[PDB]
Each structure stands twice: as structure tokens, then as C-alpha cells.
Homo-oligomer: 193 residues x 2
């Protein structure tokens, strides 16, 4: 059953529940303090939209296209978000909680402080990204690409499956866990015990 | 002044200068060379067992196929040395200088090696098995394919020392991650 038409280019305090927006083009809409429950945005285009203090819960955002869209103070909770190109977007004080970010593109992205806690993150690409102080507490990073990724001060406590060549990624003051941290040496072709 | 195929036993040359002497195929047993000086001497296929070579001075001197076993060799300055296929087994090498020295394949096995300087040395395929490297300086040291199996108290900054294909034992090998400035749990 069709969703309310989004006539405005400004929304505020508004709640959006169980709406199917797949395939929709939203053009230059600004949302502030809006909540999104059980919404579907599969393959929507959020073109030049702005999101400030907003929250997404139980929403599917897979293959969403976010060209020149900003998220500032946005929280994503139990969201599916595969294959998203973030490369053109602006992120700031982003939080992801138990999201699935498989295959996402973060090349070059400024992500200082990002929270990606308890997330499935396979084959996501973080090349040239700024991830200072990023918090990957307990995420699965299997097959994700770290390369000239600034990782200074980031947390990989209880994270798993992270391949980080330490010659091409700054990890000063990064927090790690044992035994998982051992993978940091793989960068050296060293034989162990 | 040339010597081939001799065994020298309990000779004392402490604090003496020896000049342009060539040894080939010679054994030294319980010989004292503390503080001796070996100007321009030469050693080919020679063995020292239980000999004291502490503070020996070896200006412009050469060591090819020389085994040291159970020898005190403290504070020796090897910076000058010419050296090939050197082995040290169960020796004390504390405070020695191996500055910039070519040491491919050297064996320093079961040795005490406190406060030695390996800065700029090439120690490719070096064998440090069972040695105590406490306080020794590895800086710009080629450690490619070197073995630290069962070695202890080695501090190696993996950013300023090449360890491609080197071998380590857990748990000592964890000290490697300190080259990194990280917090562990």
C-alpha cells in the first residue's frame, strides 16, 4: 500500500513507520529530528538530502544511492545496508548499531569518530578513509579493505576478521584485543611458535 | 708468524699485542686473551673453546669460519672486523659492538647478549636460537629470515628493522607489537 507523498523539502520531528520507499527518488530533502521505523529504502536515491539528528530503526537501506547526501548525528540500528556507495556523501557523528554494511564503499570518506558497533562488515572498502577514533567494538570485518586508512585511536576491541597491513595504515594508539591482535603481524611474512 | 693446524692449550696472552699473525686450522682451549690486541691478524677455520676474550681489541682483523664455544667475549668492538661464517655458541657477548657489521648467517646460539649493539648490521638468516638479547640494540638491522626461536628479551621495532620471513616463538614474539603504539587487552 503506497506511502504518503513527500511533498516538502523540510521535515522536522516527524516519525516514519513501516513505509516502503524502494525505488523512490528524494530530491534535496532535509530531515531534522526524524525517526524511521521498519521503513524500506532498497535502491532509493537520496540525492543531495540532508539528515540531522535522525534515527533509522529496522530499516532496509540496501543499494540505496546517497550522492552528495549528508548524515550528521544519525544513528542506524539493526539496519541492513549492503553495497552502498558512501564515497560522495558527508558523514559526521554517525553511529551504526548491529547493521550489515557488507560491500559498502567508503573510499576517501571522512569518518573520524564513526561508531560501527556489532556490525557485519564483509568486503567493505575503507581505502584512504579517515577513521580516527572510530569504534569497531565487536564488529566482523571479514575481507574488508584497509589501505591508507587512518586508524589512529580507533577501537578494535573484540572486533574480528580485520586485516590491517601495519605499514600502510596508521594504528597509533589504536585499542586491540588478544588473541585477535596477532593478525597485525601477518603484514610481516614471519613464522610463529 | 704463520700457524697451521695447531692446538693451543691454556696459553695466556692477556694485555699483549700480537702483530700480523695468521692462524689457519687452529684450536684454542682455555686460553686467556683478556684485553689483548690483534693488529692485522687473521683467522681461518679456527675454533675457540672455553677461552676468555673479554675486551680484546681486533683492529683491522679478519675471521672466516671461526667457531667460539663457551667463551667470555665481553665488550668486544667488532665494528672494524672482517667476518664470514662466524659462530658463537654458549658465549657471553655482553656490551659488544657489531655496528654496521656484515653478519649474514652468523650463529649466536644459546648466548648471553645483553646490551650489544647491532645497529646498521646485516643479520640476514642470523640464528639467535636460545639467546638472551636483553637490552641489545636493533636499529636499521637487517633481520630478514633470521631465527629468534626460543630467544628472550629482544626488543625489535618492526618499523625500523626488517624481519620479513624471520621466525619467532610465542609468547616472546608478542613484544613485536610494541613497535606499534597500541593498547592491548
Amino acid at each position: 500500500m503506497p506511502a504518503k507523498t513527500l511533498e516538502s523539502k523540510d521535515y522536522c520531528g516527524e516519525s516514519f513507520v513501516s513505509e516502503d520507499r524502494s525505488g523512490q527518488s528524494l530530491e534535496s530533502i532535509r530531515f531534522e529530528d526524524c525517526t524511521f521505523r521498519q521503513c524500506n529504502f532498497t535502491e532509493a536515491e537520496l540525492n543531495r538530502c540532508k539528515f540531522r539528528e535522525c534515527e533509522f530503526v529496522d530499516c532496509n537501506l540496501s543499494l540505496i544511492s546517497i550522492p552528495q547526501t549528508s548524515f550528521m548525528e544519525v544513528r542506524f540500528v539493526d539496519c541492513k545496508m549492503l553495497g552502498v556507495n558512501w564515497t560522495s556523501a558527508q558523514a559526521g557523528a554517525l553511529s551504526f548499531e548491529r547493521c550489515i554494511l557488507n560491500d559498502s564503499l567508503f573510499y576517501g570518506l571522512y569518518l573520524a569518530g564513526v561508531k560501527m558497533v556489532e556490525c557485519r562488515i564483509h568486503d567493505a572498502n575503507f581505502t584512504e578513509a579517515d577513521c580516527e577514533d572510530a569504534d569497531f567494538t565487536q564488529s566482523d570485518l571479514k575481507g574488508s579493505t584497509f589501505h591508507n586508512t587512518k586508524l589512529t585511536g580507533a577501537s578494535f576491541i573484540d572486533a574480528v576478521n580485520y586485516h590491517i597491513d601495519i605499514f600502510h595504515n596508521d594504528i597509533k594508539r589504536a585499542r586491540f584485543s588478544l588473541p585477535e591482535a596477532a593478525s597485525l603481524l601477518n603484514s610481516l611474512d614471519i613464522e610463529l611458535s
